């Protein structure tokens, strides 16, 4: 069986902010919050992923206040807290879930200082997390059908001849959002779950389920809540339409992040 | 007879190359062992000899044909057949030396090179690094003919080593990485030849370490960062499997889940 390590790491999420023990106070019950990612050895942003499914900062446990949607997440002594309230699973699609409650770690607002909570899982941007020491999103070109490049043009998105154009650069944030490099307040967005809905660029404000994406091992870019993938409509770039569409795997649904 | 997958450079397209690489992956591993959504090749421990290898038959415009043999446990080329002669890289140990005796049994001439099939020795024998050996349909065509004529006295050793470097990347590495496969599809799509950029080189160099970091990660988070390179020289670190899911398609087996 493989060794299970215990790496110390930051947890980056909504709008690229870091999971933070507020004001560096480790009193039992002090809230966990979003905060700009530090670049030092401060303990309140460095988390040990322990073998017992515990996530620890300065020796104390990331702990949910309860098992109902909307209760806050605190720091608490690992031995004193209810054991089930200290246990978490980090899923490969960016979800951090509390197994006992089946509720998911969330930042229901995007501002610095937002109190973290547990919410019902809807695979929204507000519930996307990444354990990493990288505090900057990865900027990349996204190549797709016929080797053409995903291109941002204000609200509209389409695929067009690649040319090393800031309109063709994309910031992959730790919360699962895909942001145009020129304006990181905005997000690749599907306004809804319906098949053939046109994907566009809108504000990352709502941090919705339509704004969260995962690059799958099969080359598709998946919207987790709907289960639909990005698709160059009719496999015709001239339509200038990128849509949500059920998975069929043909070349108009294959993408590659060329970093 | 071991499973055979065929590819021809004659009229090769993006699609025909994709079908080929997909087919190779389907015979390299069953796909039932998946760690963090990334397939794992079979464990060498427990793998019977009659399932140890797969065959990749390459042909070109001149209808020269050559058959590479791939170890399914690491997707790497261990040797090749051309006509009624077969050649093999110097095996690392005695068991791999025994295992290749089960390849191309019908062939009347069998030879083991004094050199292994690692890039470092192939590069010095070719007189050039991967960073300058162009890849694409054209180079694959020429690599096929050079491999074919090595039985004849017509292929000098550097050209042979260069042909190995071409086939290994365009077949084995593309099987290991969707990223490298997409790089090959870029060359085929535009009928261009191009040396691989540093991102491809570092991915090839890191494949073993990446497999270990992923399979021994704590829920995807690595114990230590792995340093990769962008397409320009720029270096960055990876701490989590999430960015590698669309990058790596196969891993060498390291340990049990």
């Amino acid at each position, epitope marked *: 069986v493989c060794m299970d390590p215990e790496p110390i790491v930051r947890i980056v999420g909504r709008n690229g902010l870091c999971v933070d023990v507020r004001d560096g106070r480790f009193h039992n019950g002090n809230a966990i919050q979003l905060w700009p990612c530090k670049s030092n050895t401060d303990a309140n942003q460095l988390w040990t992923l322990k073998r017992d499914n515990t996530i620890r900062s300065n020796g104390k446990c990331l702990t949910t206040y309860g098992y109902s949607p909307g209760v806050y997440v605190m720091i608490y002594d690992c031995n004193t807290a209810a054991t089930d309230a200290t246990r978490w699973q980090i899923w490969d699609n960016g979800t951090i879930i509390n197994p006992r409650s089946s509720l998911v770690l969330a930042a229901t607002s995007g501002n610095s200082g937002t109190t973290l909570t547990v919410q019902t899982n809807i695979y929204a941007v507000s519930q996307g997390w990444l354990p990493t020491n990288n505090t900057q999103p990865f900027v990349t070109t996204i190549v797709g059908l016929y*080797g*053409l490049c995903l291109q941002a043009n204000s609200g509209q998105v389409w695929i067009e001849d*690649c040319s090393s154009k800031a309109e063709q650069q994309w910031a992959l944030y730790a919360d699962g959002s895909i942001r145009p490099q020129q304006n990181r307040d905005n997000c690749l967005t599907s306004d809804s779950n319906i098949r053939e809905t046109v994907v566009k660029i809108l504000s990352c404000g709502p941090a919705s389920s339509g704004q969260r994406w995962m690059f799958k091992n099969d080359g598709t870019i998946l919207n987790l809540y709907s289960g639909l993938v990005l698709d160059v409509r*009719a496999s015709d770039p*001239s339509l200038k339409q990128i849509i949500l569409y059920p998975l069929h795997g043909d070349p108009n649904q294959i993408w590659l992040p060329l970093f | 007879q071991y499973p055979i997958i065929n590819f021809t450079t004659a009229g090769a397209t*993006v699609q025909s190359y994709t079908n080929f690489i997909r087919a190779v992956r389907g015979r390299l591993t069953t796909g039932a062992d998946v760690r963090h959504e990334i397939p794992v090749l079979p464990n060498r421990v427990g793998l019977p000899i009659n399932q140890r290898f797969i065959l990749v038959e390459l042909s070109n415009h001149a209808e020269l044909s050559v058959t590479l043999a791939l170890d399914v446990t690491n997707a790497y080329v261990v040797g090749y057949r051309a006509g009624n002669s077969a050649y093999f890289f110097h095996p690392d140990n005695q068991e791999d030396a025994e295992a290749i005796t089960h390849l191309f049994t019908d062939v009347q001439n069998r030879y083991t090179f004094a050199f292994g099939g690692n890039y470092d020795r192939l590069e010095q024998l070719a007189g050039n690094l991967r960073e300058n050996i162009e890849l694409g349909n054209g180079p694959l065509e020429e690599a096929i003919s050079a491999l074919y004529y090595y039985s004849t006295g017509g292929t000098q050793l550097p050209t042979l080593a260069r042909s190995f470097i071409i086939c290994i990347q365009m077949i084995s590495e593309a099987a290991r990485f969707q990223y490298i496969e997409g790089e090959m599809r870029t060359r085929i799509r535009y009928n261009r030849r191009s040396a691989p950029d540093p991102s491809v080189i570092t991915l090839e160099n890191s494949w073993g370490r990446l497999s270990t970091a992923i399979q021994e990660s704590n829920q995807g988070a690595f114990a230590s960062p792995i340093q990769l390179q962008r397409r320009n020289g720029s270096k960055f670190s990876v701490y989590d499997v999430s960015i590698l899911i669309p990058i790596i398609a196969l891993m060498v087996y390291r340990c049990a889940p």
Partner: nanobody
Amino acid sequence: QLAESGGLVQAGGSLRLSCAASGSDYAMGWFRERDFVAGITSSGGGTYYADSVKGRFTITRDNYKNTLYLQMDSLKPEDTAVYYCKGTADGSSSLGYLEVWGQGTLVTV
């Protein structure tokens, strides 16, 4: 290369258009300015219809015969136009990909 065929009938009728290709690698679509009507991916498996014609038109393909179809049921005077076949492919151009058209077939309803 692509050539159309099968292009008059009253409102509410039926007509099937064919599209014979010379050379499966190609996504194919129908157009009728030129406007998108229907499209299908190379292997099939993805069919995408314009909103106007959805629920009335059926695009199909058959890559062992190299022919593309457009079934047009419940036609209206709104469908009267020149109907072109179109294909998109992987090669090099100013687009960055290939676009081959047809010569067009007239339909009047």
